[PDB]
Symmetry: C2
Subunit: 215 residues, 2 copies
């Protein structure tokens, strides 16, 4: 955005942060893209988040592009790289916003790598992430069990209505949605394929950040 982070990722520093009576240790947001996804649209989502207004509590906004993104490579490796980049930036209490396959990566990071890395992950937001389904089905099932039962992160699945009524669970975990109804967000896409172009998305995300911050 504004500047480049130590990890090489694009970064936006919050003017609201570091204000008078600033939070002692804040929360940084990380924006992860799926494979072969345009980072510029994802920057559209972050810029619109800034336009809406970010809580003073939020440290910075980070973008997982540039150094270093591969086209093809294993899930575990990408999550390990995400953890490495978070540790290079010395961030704590990171909020993850991921798209498509990237949501798997973030979720893997949030479920195994994050605790013994001593990184808190309060919010994990996934947009069209194929949890139900290359990636193994056993791995998907074990990840879903970790998300439903043991996870300490709040998961929010953003999908399109066509995927909602589509048979099966696409972009969301039915068990988790049943446990937490407010986790599922269904967005009207009039023009395909623009889930991230909706302003309802940014509105819900900003309301999620505010809800988490007020608590």
């Amino acid at each position: 955005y504004w500047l480049t982070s130590p990890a090489g990722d694009q970064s936006y520093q919050n003017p609201n942060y570091k204000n008078e009576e600033d939070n002692n240790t804040g929360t940084a947001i990380y924006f992860i893209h799926g494979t072969a996804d345009q980072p510029a649209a994802f920057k559209r989502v972050a810029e619109r988040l800034i336009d809406t207004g970010l809580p003073d509590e939020i440290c910075s906004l980070n973008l997982l592009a540039f150094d270093q993104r591969y086209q093809g490579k294993s899930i575990k490796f990408f999550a390990e790289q995400l953890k490495n980049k978070i540790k290079v930036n010395q961030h704590q209490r990171v909020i993850l916003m991921a798209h498509s396959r990237g949501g798997l990566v973030a979720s893997y990071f949030a479920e195994f790598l994050a605790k013994e890395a001593s990184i808190d992950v309060p919010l994990v937001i996934t947009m069209g992430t194929p949890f139900n389904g290359e990636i193994n089905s056993e791995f998907l099932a074990q990840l879903k069990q970790e998300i439903v039962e043991h996870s300490v992160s709040a998961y929010h699945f953003f999908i399109a209505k066509e995927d909602a009524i589509a048979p099966g669970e696409s972009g969301y975990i039915k068990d988790y949605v049943d446990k937490y109804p407010e986790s599922l967000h269904i967005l009207d896409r009039h023009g395909h394929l623009s889930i991230m172009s909706s302003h309802r998305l940014v509105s819900h995300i900003s309301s999620l950040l505010h809800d988490y911050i007020d608590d």
Copy 2:
């Protein structure tokens, strides 16, 4: 106010100009048996708060006399058509709830032609299309809705019903035909989908689209 049929009605204060030769598009509310009319009053009132198009004559409140426990949808639809023509209204918009939606939509498929009353919009809220009433009969109504119908159908459901397996409150074939026909509303307060303001807003913007055309 009271409508010509005797039902509870709200007249538009702006209404229309003097030289409208159209008598006027009237909105009709069909509820299932033993349902609370006051929630329907709030949804109509909220439509008024948001703003109703000047071309639309009035907001009218139907299915009223008399909710019987075991009488067929067909009887209520015949009663509805009688009440609509008592008011001589034309190109009326139907907004119906639960089994009442079947009534309205049943009316839209057979009785409306014999009345020579146009039904441009038929709006169904949590209407059990998939399922006394025959299941074969529901399938025939669904086929008539999908293929032959000339009314615009809009299905309002909650996200819980959306992700529920099967077709709940909506016809999948019609949604494939028209994606914009399906409206999924977040239901914060269980279990009253008709209560969100997002529903009534969708109705008002739908009315604006219909009036402009």
